[PDB]
């Protein structure tokens, strides 16, 4: 059935139909376009008119232009042949390697798995990153979120996770580039070809790529996360095998929605957001999950506007996670990388019954010493260190060493640090912090602990800083 | 031809025309008023109806009332015969001295001078005011703005500049009162009659006055700046002459625009302001300028709402200035007058290649010690100066002497200071601060540097005490 | 030396305590004006978005 455009304002296009009205979520095809222009039905306005969101630019559209109902929501290629390829929001190849030679397709809108479909299994996923493994460990098949303001380290961390966890992964990975830098998509693509994770000449590729970056209009940015997760859902349910899903950046899904909200005729909620922020997020997030059929370990970069973690977008995201890594500009600004806030990062599996009492005790001990120092800092900035008991100033010096031993040079960050990348086994992470807490390095200079891997390197650095 | 009023809300009057529609910016004349009531066309609404802004009160207006198109924007008298006269927003004499019989009139809307007309000449204008001359000096033909919250010293400073600058000046001056105190206009007028810069008997007056004060409805407050500028533009272009333009207070222009925008039914921007705040400001400000054809040294007082320099009005004004003098309530309350913030006042000519390396180095030296002092303020607030190290106590003590030496008795504020006004030559300003920075006066008490002119007066003052 | 030190610490710590007290008032009043303004500004943004519709 056929309609005609009646209004165009930015990404929002109104289309009138004389006969059969297309249901909400249906994909509509604009006629007379050089490249495929999809409109997704968002509302029935009445008077046989639907309001839509465009998946690409609306420049050149005319009132009266023909629009065809496809009879379904956006459907994209799924299956083995997505591996090694790059797709856009509507499933077209954007790697100039010709058609996605698949004969299996899936709608990007789908129901979330039911309560009966949930899995309660939770085992540690060691990352080799000291701060994460010690304080707020990731779980295999769990939901991981990386929070941060602009420029504090979300992408560097996700790239390091890809390096330490995904490069040696036995199953499939999906990376979804959502409203981020096209330059980062190109960096990643060529890095994966170099690492062999993507292979252009054979069928051994282990990663499927999906991109709709910040050069795209909001419709594309609003739906590209669903496209990427639809690919992942196939691998979870139809191949069964363990899937890793990386999303950078899932905030961009909510932001895209806020860009079009007023033009969809909604009264704003607080801070300019769509009234539907939480239910929109819920319908999307509840699909990003391990089920009884298959495991998805999901790692989502989550942007924090104006550095305010109370911003409705990140605030609403927390409840959807099993482990949260919260980055901080106040920490990054000191040169402490990765810029993880040790006092604002949590994990479901940080439990003495799960990680063992030794791991738990050292992690809680570390958090106590850091919180104790943080609560003293401002008092001693005025009254002076000299006013402290030898007990308090001992915990100040120790806390400052622990802060530094939490920093780590990343393999993916060598161009920023000037230091070789380091991966630290969980056992060594635990041991190192245990020793610092016990006062076993009270004699060593603060700086020996900064930007090293294992504790032995701090000892070695102490000798080097002498002469 | 003629139109009829269809709607009135405050300053906003809608008018329907049956034969021919007046263009935007056209001045309309309301028929049957005891005093001339001009409406300025702002928008075409559709259905042969224009939305207009009134230049005076709209009480007594009735729907169906007749309105005539004058066929032009507001036009005012320009030229020699404006000198010594006072006019309102629509160019009428308000001094009870009869017609202003100029040979020319000019519309109050004119396009800003184009890029090709700009002058790049940069030359110091010495004020004799220590803070300004040292840290953020004014330029001849440059744009000067004086920022301040309520009662901090904007008008005293502009009056002192009229005293210090507008006599060593051999051209013409224009003063525009915009949304300020009517009695301040009365004060200035009669002072100028007394001094002789306005002569009521001969053609020797050198100043033209234009006023639309805080008793006026917003359309008048919004346009009276353009009236003043237009008078300035004539002398700049048609006489080519060196012109001084003083405006107290340009904020009132933007505030007036906010009042009308509320009535024009626009969607508001941040802090309830008109969405057009920046372009409105731009279209007006860009006319306040020196060109290759003639020089305008402009000094504008800029009110700061609730002392907040991030308020859209003052915030947007910074980029239009070549020199800023930013006043501070906290500094005023410490008794430092003029209450200039030495770390928030800037000038484009503060450049070693323009003022010389000596001037430049002394200025940067002063701002360094003052910032170093400022950076210690958290600890001093709690614990006092005594808890500081030897080195820090030296910088604090030198900075406090510098702070005090930046204060100055103004001729205009003698009643409030109890000190005779002082004008300090530039080289003496440089020398005095140079000497303090070098530690030549470490032995002299702070208070000796307070409310004096040259450094010698601080020495003589210190000799008196102990 | 100590009798002078103990009395000078008395004087200094009394004066510090007074200053702290005066700063607490200043900051509390800054806190509250900011608390109120944040609520007011957020509400005006909402009202403005709502009025701009249909």
């Amino acid at each position: 059935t056929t309609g005609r455009i009646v209004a165009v304002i930015g990404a929002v296009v109104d289309v009138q139909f004389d006969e059969g009205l297309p249901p909400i979520l249906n994909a509509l095809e604009v006629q007379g376009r050089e490249t495929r222009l999809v409109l997704e039905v968002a509302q029935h306005l009445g008077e046989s008119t639907v309001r839509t969101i465009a998946m690409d630019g609306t420049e050149g559209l005319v009132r009266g232009q023909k629009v065809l109902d496809s009879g379904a929501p956006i459907r994209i290629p799924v299956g083995p042949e997505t591996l090694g390829r790059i797709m856009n929001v509507i499933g077209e190849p954007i790697d100039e390697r010709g058609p996605i030679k698949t004969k299996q397709f899936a709608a990007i809108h789908a129901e979330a798995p039911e309560f009966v479909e949930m899995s309660v299994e939770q085992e540690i996923l060691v990352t080799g990153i000291k701060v994460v493994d010690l304080l707020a460990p990731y779980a295999k098949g769990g939901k991981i979120g990386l929070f941060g303001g602009a420029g504090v380290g979300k992408t560097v961390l996700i790239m390091e996770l890809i390096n330490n966890v995904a490069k040696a992964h036995g199953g499939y990975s999906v990376f979804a580039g959502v409203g981020e830098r096209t330059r980062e998509g190109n960096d990643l693509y060529h890095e994966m070809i170099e690492s062999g994770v993507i292979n252009l000449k054979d069928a051994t590729s282990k990663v499927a790529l999906v991109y709709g970056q910040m050069n795209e209009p909001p419709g594309a940015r609003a739906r590209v996360a669903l496209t990427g997760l639809t690919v992942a859902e196939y691998f979870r349910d139809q191949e069964g095998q363990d899937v890793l899903l990386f999303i950078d950046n899932i905030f961009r899904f909510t932001q895209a929605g806020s860009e079009v909200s007023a033009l969809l005729g909604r009264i704003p909620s607080a801070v300019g957001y769509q009234p539907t922020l939480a239910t929109d997020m819920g319908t999307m997030q509840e699909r990003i999950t391990t089920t009884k059929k298959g495991s998805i370990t999901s790692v989502q970069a989550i942007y924090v506007p104006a550095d305010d973690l109370t911003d409705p977008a990140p605030a609403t995201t927390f409840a959807h996670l099993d482990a949260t890594t919260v980055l901080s500009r106040a920490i990054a600004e000191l040169g402490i990388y990765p810029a993880v806030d040790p006092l604002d990062s949590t994990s479901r599996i940080m439990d003495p019954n799960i990680v063992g009492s030794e791991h738990y005790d050292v992690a809680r001990g570390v958090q106590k010493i850091l919180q104790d120092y943080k609560s003293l800092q401002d008092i001693i900035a005025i009254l002076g260190m000299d006013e402290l008991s030898e007990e308090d100033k001992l915990t100040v010096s120790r806390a400052r060493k622990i802060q530094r031993f939490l920093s780590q040079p990343f393999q993916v960050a060598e161009v920023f640090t000037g230091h070789l990348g380091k991966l630290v086994p969980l056992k060594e992470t635990i041991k190192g912090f245990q020793q610092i807490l016990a006062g076993e390095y009270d004699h060593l200079p603060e700086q020996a602990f900064y930007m090293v891997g294992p504790i032995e390197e701090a000892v070695a650095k102490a000798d080097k800083l002498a002469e | 031809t003629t139109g009829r009023i269809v709607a009135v809300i405050g300053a906003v009057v809608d008018v329907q025309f049956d034969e021919g529609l007046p263009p935007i910016l056209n001045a309309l004349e309301v028929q049957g008023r005891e005093t001339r009531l001009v409406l300025e066309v702002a928008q075409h609404l559709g259905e042969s109806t224009v939305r207009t802004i009134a230049m005076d009160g709209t009480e007594g207006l009735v729907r169906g009332q007749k309105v005539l198109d004058s066929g032009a924007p507001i036009r005012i008298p320009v030229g020699p015969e404006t000198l010594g006269r006072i006019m309102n927003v629509i160019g009428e004499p308000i001094d009870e001295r009869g017609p202003i019989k100029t040979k020319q009139f000019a519309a109050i809307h004119a396009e800003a001078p184009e890029f090709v007309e700009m002058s790049v000449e940069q030359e110091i204008l010495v004020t004799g005011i220590k803070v300004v001359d040292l840290l953020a000096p004014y330029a001849k033909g440059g744009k000067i703005g004086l920022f301040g919250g309520a009662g901090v010293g904007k008008t005293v400073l502009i009056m002192e500049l009229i005293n210090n600058v507008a006599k060593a000046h051999g051209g013409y001056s224009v003063f525009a009162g915009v949304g300020e105190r009517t009695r301040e206009g009365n004060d200035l007028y009669h002072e100028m009659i007394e001094s002789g810069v306005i002569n009521l008997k001969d053609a020797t007056s050198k100043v033209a006055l234009v006023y639309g004060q805080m008793n006026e409805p917003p359309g008048a407050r919004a346009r009276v700046a353009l009236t003043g500028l237009t008078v300035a533009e004539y002398f700049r272009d048609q006489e080519g002459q060196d012109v001084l333009l003083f405006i107290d207070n340009i904020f009132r222009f933007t505030q007036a625009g906010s009042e009308v925008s509320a009535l024009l039914g626009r969607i508001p921007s941040a802090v309830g302001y008109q969405p057009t705040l920046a372009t409105d400001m731009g279209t007006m400000q860009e006319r306040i300028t020196t060109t290759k054809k003639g020089s305008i040294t402009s000094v504008q007082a800029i009110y700061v709402p609730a002392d907040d320099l991030t308020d859209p009005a003052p915030a947007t004004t910074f980029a239009h200035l070549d020199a800023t003098t930013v006043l501070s309530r906290a500094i005023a309350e410490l008794g430092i007058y003029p209450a200039v913030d030495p770390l928030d006042s800037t000038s484009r000519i503060m450049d070693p290649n323009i003022v010389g390396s000596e001037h430049y180095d002394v200025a940067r030296g002063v701002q360094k010690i003052l910032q170093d002092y400022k950076s210690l303020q958290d600890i001093i607030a709690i614990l006092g100066m005594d808890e500081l190290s030897e080195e820090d106590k030296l910088t604090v003590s030198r900075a406090r002497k510098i702070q005090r030496f930046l204060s100055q008795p103004f001729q205009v504020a003698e009643v409030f200071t109890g000190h005779l006004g002082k004008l300090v030559p530039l080289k003496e300003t440089i020398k005095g601060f140079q000497q303090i920075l070098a530690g030549e006066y470490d032995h002299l008490p702070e208070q000796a540097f307070y409310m004096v002119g040259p450094i010698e007066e601080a020495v003589a003052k210190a000799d008196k005490l102990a | 030396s100590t009798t002078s030190e103990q009395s000078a610490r008395m004087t200094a710590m009394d004066n510090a305590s007074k200053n702290a007290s005066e700063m607490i008032d200043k900051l509390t009043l800054t806190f509250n004006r900011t608390r109120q303004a944040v609520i007011t500004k957020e509400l005006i943004e909402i009202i403005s978005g709502a009025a701009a519709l249909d």
Partner: peptide, 26 residues
């Protein structure tokens, strides 16, 4: 021989600075 007396503890205004190869008080 001088040799300068104060104490170990600060927060006493100018006590140390007013008096200031041995010296008693840290």
């Amino acid at each position: 021989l001088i040799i300068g007396v104060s104490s170990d503890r600060g927060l006493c205004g100018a006590i140390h600075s007013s008096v200031a190869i041995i010296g008693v008080g840290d």
